[PDB]
Structure 1
Amino acid sequence: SSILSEVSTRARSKLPSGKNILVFGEDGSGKTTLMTKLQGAEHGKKGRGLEYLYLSVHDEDRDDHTRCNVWILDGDLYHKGLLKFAVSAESLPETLVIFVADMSRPWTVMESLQKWASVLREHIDKMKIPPEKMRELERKFVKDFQDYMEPLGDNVLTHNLGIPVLVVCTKCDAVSVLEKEHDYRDEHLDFIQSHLRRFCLQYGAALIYTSVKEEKNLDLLYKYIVHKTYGFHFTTPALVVEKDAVFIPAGWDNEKKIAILHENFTTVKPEDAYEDFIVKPPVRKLVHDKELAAEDEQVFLMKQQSLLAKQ
């Protein structure tokens, strides 16, 4: 009625809230470990299906407190419908989504990402967003990408959902172990890095390496998350100098900035299928010993009937 006008008009200074950061990833990737550790608690409890984390972001510059909603999603496809509980129309425009590719198993990176490339995409249209709002947010995100200062092209954002997106590859410490235990070549690191950069480019995604065991760039990841979901001041440069852990700001990417990384490796020119140049991790567990079935009385007895007939 009349009150709902008058009292609402008396508004004071606040900070935007209700933001909804979403994490889909392949199961067994330590997604929960990363999100919990960044939250501050070393690790909550895991489980099945959708999980909730209220990420408390405090701004000392304004001295305020806010909570974003980490809706971390289970990896199994049979738990894909419950994603309707994660993203809806009133929540969609202010959602940021990060996929997690556990580098402990590089052989399962791209398709897992590409699984996301289906799932969220499907979920973004099953909800039937009206075309005008999807279009306006898409062009808004395109502009927000283009104005990076520390672009346009055929594949840049060539298919995207118009909300900010990251590809946070966890467990980067493991790259050392799988380097020596597998003789996994450094040029292969360059190849996965370039392919991930092409993936993030066609989604305009900012890519970040991070290692929980090394507590590496966790502060940087927090900074970037707060910068994107809120719009906080950002000062970190494009940390791409060392290959152990890299931070690719959304917009720093260019086709030539991937060409330079293409140049240094000369093993197999990168158009090749990701999976081919990486080596499959062979399955360890042996197949169960075959059934020692007993021949039934009937065909057995018929066989002895035949034997006695031979007599």
Structure 2
Amino acid sequence: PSGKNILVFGEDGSGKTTLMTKLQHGKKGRGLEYLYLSVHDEDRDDHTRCNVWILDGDLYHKGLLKFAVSAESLPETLVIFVADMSRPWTVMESLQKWASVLREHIDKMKIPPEKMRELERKFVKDFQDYMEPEEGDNVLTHNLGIPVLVVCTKCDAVSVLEKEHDYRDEHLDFIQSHLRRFCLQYGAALIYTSVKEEKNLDLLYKYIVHFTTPALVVEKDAVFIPAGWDNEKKIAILHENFTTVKPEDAYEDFIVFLMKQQSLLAKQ
């Protein structure tokens, strides 16, 4: 096979050690490098270079980010970017930023073509049709379909951020609600990961390309969700934990000449 693509986006890097080690540069802040990954066929690799470029920053590198998400990923383009589950603003911001980064790498590079959404309608209809239900459907997703796996990492700092401003798991439930709202607003896998819990970021990407992955939020540490877990009724009604029902405001409200002259005047 040939080389596919995925454009994982990380804002200026900012410590991609644990997040990169859980999944797979010139410096700690290089900027839109070309990382990779691979898929399998039950026995080994068959030159299927399904690259997952974890671009740790993109300082004036829109062309490098577009080169990373090449057009060869028409059959499988699942960007699995890192995130910060310390607060709801960072979780919702990273998920929406992942979808917008995939759309930016596409639209900032595919300005010449226009029938891509036309072919994507039938292809993504046959693809997401068998993946919309079984959320553990009808979710208000975006205008088109861009698979962006929002891997919510850094939930080990979720307790410190939740106790510094709420002294309980209120910010944790808020981050869970942020992931759920972005999921119902986009239709993907809001798989969150905490300290030694739910290490399944590329699992949803592998199950929805053309391993294991759980989904639970009762532990109040990692609200994992599969690619298809998107609803806004029970989660929106139970979103009142230290807030209102179906809220998104948490993301927005949480993101010696003069000396000689003086001597002469003093002497007078």
What TM-score, normalized to structure 2? 0.71
Contact 2:208 2:227 in 1 (8 A): no
The answer to whether the 8 Å contact 2:172/2:221 transfers is no
- Check conservation: 1:190, 1:261, Cα contact below 8 A: no
Report the Cα offset of residue 25 of structure 1.
1.7
Unpaired runs of at least 5, structure 1: 1-15, 227-232, 279-298
Report how many residues are paired. 266
Query: Where do residues 17-32 of structure 1 align in structure 2 (5 Å cutoff)?
Result: 18-31=3-16
Instruction: Name the structure 2 match of 1:197.
Output: 180
Distance (Å, rounded) in 1 between the aligned partners of 2:16 and 2:126: 27
Q: Residues 62, 133 of structure 1: CA spacing in aligned structure 2 closer, same or farther, 3 A cutoff? A: farther
Query: What is the DSSP-based 3-state SS (H/G/I as helix, E as strand, rest coil) of the residue aligned with 1:302?
Result: helix
Identity among equivalent pairs (%): 100
Q: Report the secondary structure of 1:200's partner residue.
A: helix
Aligned in 2, Cα 1:240/1:22: closer, same or farther, shift over 3 Å? same
Distance (Å, rounded) in 2 between the aligned partners of 1:36 and 1:73:
14
What 5-or-longer segments of structure 2 have no aligned partner? none
Q: Which structure would you say has the larger RCO, counting Cα contacts within 8 Å and 6 or more residues apart?
A: 2
> Quick one: distance in 2 between partners of 1:63 and 1:88?
20
Cα drift, residue 24 of structure 1: 0.4
Question: In 2, are the aligned partners of 1:150 and 1:237 still within 8 Å (CA)?
Answer: no
Classify 1:239/1:113 alpha carbon distance in 2 versus 1 (closer, same or farther; 3 Å): closer
Distance 1:309 1:104 in 2: 64
* Between 299-308 and 259-268, the greater mean CA deviation after superposition: 299-308
Call closer, same or farther: CA 1:209–1:130 in 2, change over 3 Å: same
User: Looking at CA atoms only, which structure, 1 or 2, has the larger radius of gyration?
Assistant: 1
Cα pair 1:80 1:119 within 8 Å, conserved: no
Q: Describe the shift of the 1:133–1:33 C-alpha distance in structure 2 as closer, same or farther (beyond 3 A).
A: farther
Paired residues of 1:170 and 1:212 also in contact (CA < 8 A): no
Q: How far does the alpha carbon of each residue in 1:241-262 deviate from its partner, in whole angstroms, 9 at most, with x for none? A: 4332232122221121432432
The structure where helix makes up a greater share of residues is: 1
SS of 1:117's equivalent?
helix
RMSD: 4.6
For the 8 Å contact 2:5–2:51, the answer to whether it is kept is yes
* Equivalent position of 2:32 in the other structure: 50
* 1:20 Cα deviation after fit: 1.4
For the 8 Å contact 1:156–1:202, the answer to whether it is kept is yes
Aligned counterparts of 2:132 and 2:93: Cα–Cα separation in 1: 32
8 Å contact from structure 1 (residues 29, 100) kept in 2? no
Change (3 A) 1:267 1:160: closer
The Cα offsets for residues 125-184 of structure 1, whole Å up to 9 and x where unpaired, read as 232356653223542475357535697x99945435522121101122332344445555
What is the alpha-carbon distance in structure 1 between the residues aligned to residue 111 and residue 191 of structure 2? Answer: 30
Going from structure 1 to structure 2, the CA distance change for 1:271 and 1:210 (only over 3 Å counts) comes to closer
1-structure distance, mates of 2:21, 2:112: 35
Task: Measure the CA separation in 2 of the matches of 1:102 and 1:47.
Answer: 17
CA gap 1:134/1:184 in 2 versus in 1, 3 angstroms:
farther
Q: Is the 8 A contact 1:29 1:102 kept in 2?
A: no
